[PDB]
Design a protein that fits this description.
Number of strands of chain C: 4
Chains: A alpha+beta, B alpha+beta, C alpha+beta
Subcellular location (chain A): Nucleus
Number of strands of chain A: 2
Oligomer: part of a larger assembly
Strand order of the largest sheet of chain A: 1-2
Radius of gyration of chain C: 31 Å
Number of helices of chain C: 6
Structural class of chain A: alpha+beta
Family (chain A): Belongs to the Mediator complex subunit 17 family.
Order of helices and strands of chain A: HEE
Structural class of chain C: alpha+beta
Protein name (chain A): Mediator of RNA polymerase II transcription subunit 17
Strand content of chain A: 5-15%
Shape of chain A: flat
Largest interface: B-C, 18 and 20 residues
Family (chain C): Belongs to the Mediator complex subunit 27 family.
Helix content of chain C: 40-55%
Largest sheet of chain C: 4 strands, antiparallel
Distance between the termini of chain A: 36 Å
Largest sheet of chain A: 2 strands, antiparallel
Number of helices of chain A: 1
InterPro entries (chain C): Mediator_Med27 (IPR021627)
Order of helices and strands of chain C: HHHHEEEEHH
Distance between the termini of chain C: 44 Å
Bound molecules: zinc ion
């Protein structure tokens, strides 16, 4: 229950980030294989036009 | 398991046996190492062929049974049940309580078993033992243990253990450290005092 | 053999340098005098240059014998068609260029399926050398391949791939049950060691460092080459702080493009 609630809270934070800040861009990606307790997610906040340079 | 260095240091003209032990512990507290509890290694000999039927508090299930120089049986409880039945092939040979009693300390996965040596009730020595956890292969990390020895011992810094002469590239075994302990017991039992 | 054929070069140059230097000794003393205003700037320079050229001859003579000590020891028509194939090897190096890997890439924005046997052929190419390490490929869960690697008597590593690309990599020691109770490879766990957990972060930074958008084979090859330096762990001191232990930690962090053990503080 704590794992599900904490994932929901992280989703709430990233949704606040997405709705509040659309300036550079927002990207959220999740691992297709997951554990019962711990997860691994990827968060990207990269600029609008020249993302391929700022790696 | 991990690579171990075992040695003696005497009273060394300062007060008593445990004064230098307390000096080492306060030096380690200056470094700031936490404890993990206590430890004691107890020995007992038997003969008809000298049987070293011996124990360690780190692994109480590990009942060590050695010759004078042959193979070692790190055996279970039922071996101790079988050992009683002979009594004529292998006599008791009492009064062999040469023990090392002390405490263990931890500093960032580093372990120290430091204490004093007693012939039962009477303490006549100081056992110094340093070790590291993840030391899987032997004779590859002796620079680390030498640096650790010169870090806080100062005087009486040892080197070149007897089981290091037993050169092999496999995993270090608790029998090696155990061997070192019985060689330590042979070193201390001669002087008595 | 070519060690003597290239060690002879210094001596065959040194004897001609001896001839040239003794010719200089002859003609500079034979040149007479060039006063250049003051005499004290000439006559005191006379002994200076007379020591200079004679001592140059002397040192040339001297370095001759230390090179001489180290050294040791249809008829011509079809010989001409032999070495041209050997200079064609230089002709192969003629069009190489030093531009190499580095390019001038801009943003890649405008204005797939591969069999697992290809992954097996990929992993068979580099496992053939480095016999001290082993590779055990397995797919008990889907077509994705996760591999067991033993490193002599030191390390046991699980290396998970997915979609022919990298998924994950976890390293443990040599005396632990890397399998589960069922016998399958463990997926989600921890190494239960401070140094190992510390260097798993370095591994995660390294996998996001080797970035090839099309060619992940060199990514994983550079990754395992980087990992090959980690069989020297607990055996090499740090390159800047001298001692092994930085707050009790031996050097582990190999720098990018320069593989030598460091710490986070040691950079
Ligand atoms: Zn360092």
């Amino acid at each position: 229950a704590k794992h599900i609630f904490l994932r929901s809270r992280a989703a709430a934070t990233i949704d606040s980030l997405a709705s509040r800040i659309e300036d550079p861009q927002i990207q959220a990606h999740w691992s297709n294989i997951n554990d019962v307790y711990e997860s691994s997610v990827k968060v990207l906040i990269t600029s609008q036009g020249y993302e391929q340079i700022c790696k | 398991m991990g690579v171990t260095c075992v040695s003696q240091m005497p009273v060394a003209e300062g007060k008593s046996v445990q004064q230098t032990v307390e000096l080492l512990t306060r030096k380690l507290e200056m470094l700031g190492a936490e404890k993990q509890g206590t430890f004691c290694v107890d020995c007992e000999t038997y003969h008809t062929k000298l049987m070293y039927v011996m124990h360690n508090s780190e692994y109480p299930l590990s009942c060590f049974a050695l010759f004078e120089n042959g193979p070692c049986l790190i055996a279970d409880t039922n071996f101790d049940v079988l050992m009683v039945k002979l009594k004529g092939f292998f006599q008791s040979a009492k009064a062999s309580k040469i023990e090392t009693r002390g405490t263990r300390y931890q500093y960032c996965d580093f372990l120290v078993k430091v204490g004093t040596v007693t012939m039962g009730p009477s303490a006549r020595g100081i056992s110094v033992e340093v070790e590291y956890g993840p030391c899987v292969v032997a004779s590859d990390c002796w620079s680390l243990l030498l640096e650790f020895l010169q870090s806080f011992l100062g005087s009486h810094t040892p080197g070149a253990p007897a089981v290091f002469g037993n050169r092999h590239d496999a995993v270090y075994g608790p029998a090696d450290t155990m061997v070192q302990y019985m060689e330590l017991f042979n070193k201390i039992r001669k002087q008595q005092q | 053999v070519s060690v003597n054929l290239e060690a002879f070069s210094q001596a065959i140059s040194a004897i001609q340098a001896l001839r040239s230097s003794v010719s200089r000794v002859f003609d500079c003393l034979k040149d007479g005098m060039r006063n250049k205003e003051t005499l004290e700037g000439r006559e005191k320079a006379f002994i200076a240059h007379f020591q200079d050229n004679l001592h140059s001859v002397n040192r040339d003579l001297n370095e001759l014998e230390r090179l001489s000590n180290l050294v040791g020891k249809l008829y011509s028509q079809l010989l001409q068609a032999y070495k041209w194939s050997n200079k064609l090897q230089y002709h192969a190096g003629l069009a190489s260029g030093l531009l190499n890997q580095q390019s001038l890439k801009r943003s890649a924005n405008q204005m797939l399926v591969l069999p697992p046997q290809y992954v097996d052929d990929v992993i068979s190419r580099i496992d053939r050398m480095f016999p001290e390490m082993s590779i055990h490929l397995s797919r008990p869960n889907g077509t994705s391949a996760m591999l067991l690697v033993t490193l002599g008597k030191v390390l046991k590593v699980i290396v998970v791939m997915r979609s022919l690309f990298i998924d994950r990599t976890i390293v443990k020691g040599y005396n632990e049950n890397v399998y589960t109770e069922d016998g399958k490879l463990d997926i989600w766990s921890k190494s239960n060691y401070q140094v190992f957990q510390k260097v798993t972060d370095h591994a995660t930074t390294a996998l996001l460092h080797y970035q090839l958008p099309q060619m992940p084979d060199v990514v994983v090859r550079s990754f395992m080459t980087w990992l090959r330096s980690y069989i020297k762990l607990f055996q090499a001191p740090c390159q800047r702080c001298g001692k092994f232990l930085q707050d009790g930690l031996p050097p582990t962090w190999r720098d990018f493009r320069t593989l030598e053990a460091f710490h986070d503080t040691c950079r």
